[PDB]
Ligand binder design. Sequence first.
Ligand SMILES: [Zn+2]
Lengths: 192, 136, 59, 182, 79, 126, 49
Amino acid sequence: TANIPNKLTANVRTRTGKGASRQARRDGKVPAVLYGHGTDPQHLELNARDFAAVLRSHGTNAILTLDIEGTEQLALTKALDVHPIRRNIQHADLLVVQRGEKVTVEVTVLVEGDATPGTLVTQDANTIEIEAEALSIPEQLTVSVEGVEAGTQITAGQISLPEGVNLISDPELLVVNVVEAPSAEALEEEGA
Amino acid sequence: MLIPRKVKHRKQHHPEQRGIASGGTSVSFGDYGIQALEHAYITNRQIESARIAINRHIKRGGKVWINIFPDRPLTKKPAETRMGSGKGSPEWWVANVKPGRVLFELSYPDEKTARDALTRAIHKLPIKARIVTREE
Amino acid sequence: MKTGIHPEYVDTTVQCGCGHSFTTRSTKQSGTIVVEVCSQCHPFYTGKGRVARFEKRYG
Amino acid sequence: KALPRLKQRYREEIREALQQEFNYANVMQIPGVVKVVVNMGVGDAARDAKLINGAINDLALITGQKPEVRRARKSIAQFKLREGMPIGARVTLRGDRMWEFLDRLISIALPRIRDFRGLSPKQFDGTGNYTFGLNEQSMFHEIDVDSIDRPRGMDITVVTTATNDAEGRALLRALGFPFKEN
Amino acid sequence: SSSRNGRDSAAQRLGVKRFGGQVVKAGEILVRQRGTHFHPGVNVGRGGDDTLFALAPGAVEFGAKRGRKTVNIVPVARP
Amino acid sequence: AHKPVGQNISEVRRNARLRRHARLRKKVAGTAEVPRLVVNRSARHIHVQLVNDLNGTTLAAASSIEADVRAIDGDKKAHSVRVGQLIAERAKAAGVETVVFDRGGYTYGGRIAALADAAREAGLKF
Amino acid sequence: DVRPKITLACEVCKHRNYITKKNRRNDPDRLEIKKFCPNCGTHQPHKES
RNA sequence: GGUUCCCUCAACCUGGACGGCAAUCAGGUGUUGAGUGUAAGUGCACAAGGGAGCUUGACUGCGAGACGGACAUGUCGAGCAG
Ligand SMILES: [Zn+2]
């Protein structure tokens, strides 16, 4: 997988703190940090509406290309600070990367397909860890439940991975659990 | 009704109702959830009344999770007595809920029935709440 | 080894009915003792009056 | 200027046999015996203290030295056992006196067992140590049948330098233990 | 009905009496405590009830020695 | 292959001695005026030192490794007496009059006591 | 009284110097002990009265 | 109680005549989860916990300097001599 990096304009902050971050967010901006093997963090500011557009389509682990006052940089989204209620982006950790480098990333797994009609599909693990190239991170991973019968454990070792992607988490994670659909009598005894 | 087997201290101070929730603000088990928006003590009777409303609506299939447990007791002194002479005996068990906390969860094949079943349960709770999903 | 608390110990001699003899130290005061079965006598090791009456009266 | 025949036999016969069978890298790895401990856990002496006197006297005759008098380190209601009372005895044997006791047990004591069928080779302890029990005290010539009062057995254990069970049997077999073919 | 509680004991006024940097005499009480939350150091002794008192004049200094909190007395120098 | 199961007697002996030597040092300590006399005893030799614990520096030292001590025709106890006399000569030369005996975590008696009694009549008092 | 108060008197001068408590079921006999006697000026055997 | 010296538990695994979840024996892992006369708290593995030998300081005349305090009470104390 080859991903064209997303271009985003970044400005170096002049004032940091909690009084300056609140004012920055009031102007449609998000504070950010750019650490990595550069080993000297840079305090940046990003457009709030432009950053959210990149995350909406290309996933949470989006590769970026920051224009830090005329200098091009390849960066990867490492973490996000989201308000529980207002559902904002209060911060963003950015990690510097270079082409041909391996990073450890959690990607999401999706469950597609319709199983036997007398079954209920329950997904235990939301995401699994991989180790792929910097510009070759899959946007999402998929599994298929088509004709799966009764009680089966679909494990993290049976997820079909693209080339150049290696599983990091142990191959015994119960990712998808397919079980018999509960009856009406089995509902009334759960949580009493 | 949910009741702890035992507690070290049977008479306790009231739980504080300040701040927002630190943990438990995301849907982990099911596909849909109910997220609180106000502070309240959710009694163990409103949880039973709210998870039977979900059971009736979805009938047979699906699974329901209750992420809050009524651990902390509240007392009530005998009726028609003056103030003083001790502290009342415990009578009901509550759960301290802060805004952002996710209370219930549900897994069901189709969406229209799932969101209707969870709405039937928000009307039994003494607070405002909203339906949230696993997606971002 | 403390002096006045241990049982009096004697160099002994073991004799068996098969002619096998030993020389060991034991607590037997006599300094000798006879055994009717030893390592060489026993069938389990070697793999090989009531019963004498079976061959006496009946034969 | 005297050696027990088991120690005499071990020095030049048993040691060389073990070297060829396992092919050690140094002569300091050759397995050997460390001590022999003889135990009689009465347990019924909690009902009458005079019971412990029988075990004390017998072990001095069988082994050749005075025992201890072990005391319970816990009070247990179901056994009516209170902490601090005699519950058993113990004798440890090292040096020469171990070699004679191992000699008399193998040569003399074991064959006198009525319906003797040897000792199981699975009684080993994890890392090359052996233990077994007896149901009586009548298999020893040092004790006399005239002065017996009631049956009472021992619990014989041998501690060896052997690393695991494989060398434990080899050292004991070459000593002449009657192990069943299992 | 009534309450079976309602007892308590007098406050014992424990704590640290001389803080770091204070100049003290000899025999002056530094810390009153139940156990050895603080351990005696140099020129400091332990009382019968685990009180810490100064064995020589100087200035108090709190330190640590192998994970143990200690109280030491340093000899301020004569003019 | 081979893999030892328990603890050797040398490993048990080493940690047990340092266990009961640190117990000793909770009382005795060295000062410039009253230095600490530390003794190390082995199956072959015996060593002594005169340590000042404020600086952690050694004032004087004698040992049985020296050629003069090796010339003695006696037994091990005879070597201790020679070493005990050689530490009172060097300590008093350095200007030391009183010391404290740190027996090193060994039982007092035999080679340790013979060294101390030889250094007591030679001038060092403790 | 299980633990009554007892007085220890010097053997020599018979002066009553010390007072203490002992269990009269565990120690049915008169307590014998060596304590300092101010009158004699030295440590002397003391006995219960 | 004073002093001198020595030691490390509880739990679990494995092997053992009565004997079992649990008595006494043996080997291994085990850093404090055991124990501290007596409630709780602060401490104690450096042991204040476990064992042994001798013993009476469970003294006489005193006490620099302090803690705490309406007052009367209460508490700690290096050091000097017998
Ligand atoms: Zn007198």
